[PDB]
Amino acid sequence: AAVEDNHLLIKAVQNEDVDLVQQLLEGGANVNFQEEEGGWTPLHNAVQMSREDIVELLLRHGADPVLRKKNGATPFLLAAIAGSVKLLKLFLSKGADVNECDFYGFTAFMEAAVYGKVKALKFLYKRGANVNLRRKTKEDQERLRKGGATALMDAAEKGHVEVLKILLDEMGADVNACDNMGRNALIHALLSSDDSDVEAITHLLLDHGADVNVRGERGKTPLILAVEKKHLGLVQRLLEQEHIEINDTDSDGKTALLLAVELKLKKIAELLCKRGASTDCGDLV
Numbered sequence: 086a087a088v089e090d091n092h093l094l095i096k097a098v099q100n101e102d103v104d105l106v107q108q109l110l111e112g113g114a115n116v117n118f119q120e121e122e123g124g125w126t127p128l129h130n131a132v133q134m135s136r137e138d139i140v141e142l143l144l145r146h147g148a149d150p151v152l153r154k155k156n157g158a159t160p161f162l163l164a165a166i167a168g169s170v171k172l173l174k175l176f177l178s179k180g181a182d183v184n185e186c187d188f189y190g191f192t193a194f195m196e197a198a199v200y201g202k203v204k205a206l207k208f209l210y211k212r213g214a215n216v217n218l219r220r221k222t223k224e225d226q227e228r229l230r231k232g233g234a235t236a237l238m239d240a241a242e243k244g245h246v247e248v249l250k251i252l253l254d255e256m257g258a259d260v261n262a263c264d265n266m267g268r269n270a271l272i273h274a275l276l277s278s279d280d281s282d283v284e285a286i287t288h289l290l291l292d293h294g295a296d297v298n299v300r301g302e303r304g305k306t307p308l309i310l311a312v313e314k315k316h317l318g319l320v321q322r323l324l325e326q327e328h329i330e331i332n333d334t335d336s337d338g339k340t341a342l343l344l345a346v347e348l349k350l351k352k353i354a355e356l357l358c359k360r361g362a363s364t365d366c367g368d369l370v
C-alpha cells in the first residue's frame with residue numbers, strides 16, 4: 086500500500102497533478118522515494134519537467150535537494166539539462182556545488198553544452214563553473230580509455246554552433262584538450278551524426294588552432310573522417326594546415342587518398358594525390 090502510493094506520487098508529478106501531489110504527501114507518501122530502474126525521485130521528475138512550483142512543493146515537504154539517482158545525477162544537474170536558470174540558482178542555494186558531477190563525470194556546465202542551453206551555460210560560467218574540466222568516470226570505464234571529455238567536445242559532437250562560439254571566444258575553452266582516448270574537439274566534431282553543422286563547427290575549431298594530427302578509435306584522423314563524410318570544403322581547409330600528415334593510415338591500412346579513390350571522390354582524390362609523392366594525379370577515379 087505504501088509502495089503503490091509512492092509510485093502514485095511519482096506519476097502525479099509526471100502528470101503535473103499538483104492537488105494529487107499535495108494529497109499524497111499530506112497522506113504520508115515518501116517524498117524521497119526512488120523508483121527501481123533508474124533511482125529517480127519525485128524531485129528529479131519535477132526538475133526534468135521544469136516545474137518550479139512542484140519543485141518548491143516537494144522541497145517544503147522535505148525532499149532532499151541533493152539526493153542522487155543511480156547515474157549519480159543530482160537535481161542541480163537535471164536543471165542544467167532542462168536549461169532552467171531559476172532551478173540552477175535554487176539548488177545552488179540548497180547545497181549544490183557548481184562543479185559537481187555524476188558518476189560518468191558530467192557537470193552542469195557540460196550538460197548545458199550537450200543540450201545547447203546557452204542561458205544556463207552563461208549563468209553557470211558566471212557562477213564559477215570550470216570550463217575545461219575533463220570527465221572523471223568509473224574506474225572500469227577509465228581502463229577502457231573512456232572519460233576525459235570536455236564541454237567543448239560535447240558542443241562539437243552535438244553540433245551546437247552558438248555554444249561552441251561562446252565557449253571559444255568568451256569562456257576560455259581549451260580547443261586542444263583531449264579525452265582519455267586521445268580525441269579532441271575536432272575529432273568529436275567529425276564523428277557527429279548530424280550533417281547539419283559539421284562544416285561550421287570544424288571551421289570554427291580550425292580558426293582557434295585545433296590540432297589536425299590527432300587520432301580517434303581505429304586510427305582515424307580528421308582528414309580521413311572528412312574524406313569519409315565526402316566534404317570537399319573540409320578537406321581543403323584541413324590541407325591548408327601546416328603540420329597535416331596526409332599519409333597516415335587508419336586501422337584498416339587506408340589513407341585519406343585510398344579512401345577518396347574507393348568512394349570515387351574525384352576532386353578530393355586529386356587534391357590529396359597532389360599533396361603526396363605521386364606524379365600522376367588526374368586520372369585516379
Ligand SMILES: Nc1ncnc2c1ncn2[C@@H]1O[C@H](COP(=O)(O)O[C@@H]2[C@H](O)[C@@H](COP(=O)(O)O[C@@H]3[C@H](O)[C@@H](COP(=O)(O)O)O[C@H]3n3cnc4c(N)ncnc43)O[C@H]2n2cnc3c(N)ncnc32)[C@@H](O)[C@H]1O
Nearest residue numbers: 122123124125130133154156189191199220231232233234
Ligand atoms: N523521468 C525519467 N526520465 C528518464 N528516464 C527515467 C525516468 N524515470 C525513470 N527512468 C529510468 O532511468 C533509467 C536511467 O536513465 P538516466 O537518464 O537516469 O541515466 C542514463 C543512463 O542510465 C546513464 C548511463 O548511460 P550509458 O551507460 O549509456 O552511458 C553514457 C556514456 O557512455 C557515458 C559516458 O559518456 P562519454 O564521457 O563517453 O561521452 O555517460 C552516459 N552519457 C552519455 N551522455 C550523457 C549525458 N549527456 N549526461 C549524462 N550521461 C551521459 O546515463 C544516463 N544518460 C545516458 N545518456 C544520457 C543523456 N544523453 N543525457 C542524460 N543522461 C543520459 C532509464 O533507462 C529509465 O528507464
